[PDB]
Amino acid sequence: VKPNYALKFTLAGHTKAVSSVKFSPNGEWLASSSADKLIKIWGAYDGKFEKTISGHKLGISDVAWSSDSNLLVSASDDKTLKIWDVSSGKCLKTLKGHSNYVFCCNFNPQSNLIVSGSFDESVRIWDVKTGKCLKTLPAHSDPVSAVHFNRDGSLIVSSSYDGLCRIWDTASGQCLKTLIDNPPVSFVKFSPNGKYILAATLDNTLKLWDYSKGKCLKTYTGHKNEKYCIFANFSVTGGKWIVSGSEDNLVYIWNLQTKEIVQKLQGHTDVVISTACHPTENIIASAALENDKTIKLWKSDC
Ligand SMILES: CS(=O)(=O)c1cc(NS(=O)(=O)c2cc(Br)ccc2O)cc(S(F)(F)(F)(F)F)c1
């Protein structure tokens, strides 16, 4: 069994490299962030540009949605995060504390907390309602490349160019596990069931780990990833797929269990820096760097 993803829309508008794309939890919207300091909102099913959200002073590396699809958080080189009301475009809060670029961000499932990681090598946990920093974790010894809450928010996983992945107890901020040769870890996230973590390293390798056992369950290879923080995803709506961008301008799709490449999506004209999987439909969003600057939407039958 193989997917048959086909190009449906090319979304243009960002004026610099795109950095991240995320589908709203209710499936209705795609949000994109860019080095052009802008967030853009697009319709997930017709590709129609909806709006631009501006306010950050420098480029944006990441955006994430609240669970009710009403709020966005953005992480910027201006050392802040911003909480936005998607409906109004208004900045509700500016999260200040990091001493250097904020690279990654995420709400917890409750969406009362935000987790952030920064070039300043720290992970921060923030109160959505007040905008106050609740905890600062001395998480890593190099820039933090990704932060992600597990299925119920009990745990955070972080990745860093220092070569480490770490599991943190959200409530206490204590490091429960450190996964340890150490190529830079450019991305990480929890699996759908919360038992595994998917980590990308800058040696063209994706790895599925049982972090409790410290055992590598799966390895996915064949793509190019030696430089950039490139998101990876679990595709849960049809076939069980792993999806990632690549520095050879392609979208790679692997069979979760067999690790075989089942599809490569051709079309972008620069590094595919970010991919996202729609929560209910077999739809992928892909986004590329500044020779391209577009987002593409792809649809599969399975
Ligand atoms: C038995 S299975 O085929 O259902 C299976 C489920 C998981 N669980 S998971 O990664 O969280 C996950 C991924 C995706 Br995509 C969709 C749903 C989902 O639950 C992991 C594996 S493994 F990859 F660990 F054993 F090596 F093959 C196998």
| Nearest CA owner, ligand 1 atom 15 | 240
Please give the structure tokens belonging to residue 258: 């067999």
Ligand 1 center from residue 191 Cα (angstroms): 8
| Nearest CA owner, ligand 1 atom 21 | 257
Write down the H helix ranges in 164-247: none
* Rounded CA separation 112/128 (Å): 5
Return the beta strands (E) in 55-194 as ranges.
60-65, 71-76, 80-85, 91-96, 102-107, 113-118, 123-127, 133-137, 144-149, 155-160, 165-169, 175-179, 185-190
CB 289 within 8 A of CB 270: yes
CB 256 within 8 A of CB 300: no
Ligand 1 center from residue 241 Cα (angstroms): 9
Q: Which atom number of ligand 1 is nearest to the Cα of residue 241?
A: 15
Handedness of CA 228, 229, 234, 238 (dihedral sign): negative
Total length of the chain: 302
CB 80 within 8 A of CB 102: yes
CB atoms within 10 A of CB 179: 20
Ligand 1 center from residue 17 Cα (angstroms): 33
Distances (CA, A) of 180 to 166, 167, 211: 9, 12, 10
The verdict on the CB of residue 191 being under 6 Å from ligand 1 is yes
Question: Which method, experimentally, gave rise to this model?
Answer: X-ray
- DSSP-assigned letter for residue 100: S
- Closest alpha carbon to 287 in 263, 269, 301: 269
Please give the structure tokens belonging to residue 186: 């450019």
Q: Which amino acid is at 155?
A: L
- Closest alpha carbon to 35 in 74, 84, 82: 74
Q: Which atom number of ligand 1 is nearest to the Cα of residue 240?
A: 15
Residue 270 buriedness (CB in 10 A; 0-12 / 13-18 / 19+): middle
Indicate the resolution in Å. Answer: 1.8
How big is the chain by its Cα radius of gyration, in Å? 17
- Closest alpha carbon to 265 in 233, 223, 230: 223
Indicate the SS3 state at residue 34.
Answer: strand
* Rounded CA separation 254/271 (Å): 18
Residue 177 buriedness (CB in 10 A; 0-12 / 13-18 / 19+): middle
* Rounded CA separation 186/57 (Å): 25
* Rounded CA separation 135/190 (Å): 21
- Closest alpha carbon to 145 in 189, 204, 82, 194: 189
Ligand 1 center from residue 146 Cα (angstroms): 21
Q: Tell me how far apart the 2 most distant CA atoms of the chain are, in Å.
A: 48
Helices then strands, counting H and E runs in the chain, come out as 0, 28
* Rounded CA separation 79/106 (Å): 16
* Rounded CA separation 74/57 (Å): 12
| Residues near 219 by beta carbon (within 8 Å), at least 6 away in sequence | 205, 206, 207, 208, 259
Indicate the SS3 state at residue 141.
Answer: coil
Please give the structure tokens belonging to residue 58: 């420098």
Residue 193 buriedness (CB in 10 A; 0-12 / 13-18 / 19+): exposed
Please give the structure tokens belonging to residue 33: 């962030």
Cα 116 from chain centroid (whole Å): 12
Beta bridge partner(s), residue 264 = 252
The verdict on the CB of residue 258 being under 6 Å from ligand 1 is no
The verdict on the CB of residue 235 being under 6 Å from ligand 1 is yes
Q: Which amino acid is at 110?
A: Q
* Rounded CA separation 242/195 (Å): 16
Residue 124: CA count within 13 A, CB half-sphere: 29
The region that residue 214 occupies, defined by phi over 0 for left and psi between -120 and 50 for alpha, beta otherwise, is left
For 228-260, give the secondary structure using H, E and C.
Answer: CCCCEEEECCCCCEEEECCCCCCEEEEECCCCC
Angle at 96 between CA 22 and CA 41, to 5 degrees: 25
- Closest alpha carbon to 242 in 230, 256, 261: 256
Fold of 1-302: Methylamine Dehydrogenase; Chain H (2.130.10)
Beta bridge partner(s), residue 279 = none
Angle at 75 between CA 79 and CA 132, to 5 degrees: 70
The verdict on the CB of residue 193 being under 6 Å from ligand 1 is yes
Residue 219 buriedness (CB in 10 A; 0-12 / 13-18 / 19+): exposed
Beta bridge partner(s), residue 110 = none
Ligand 1 center from residue 173 Cα (angstroms): 28
CB 91 within 8 A of CB 133: no
- Closest alpha carbon to 272 in 224, 200, 208, 202: 224
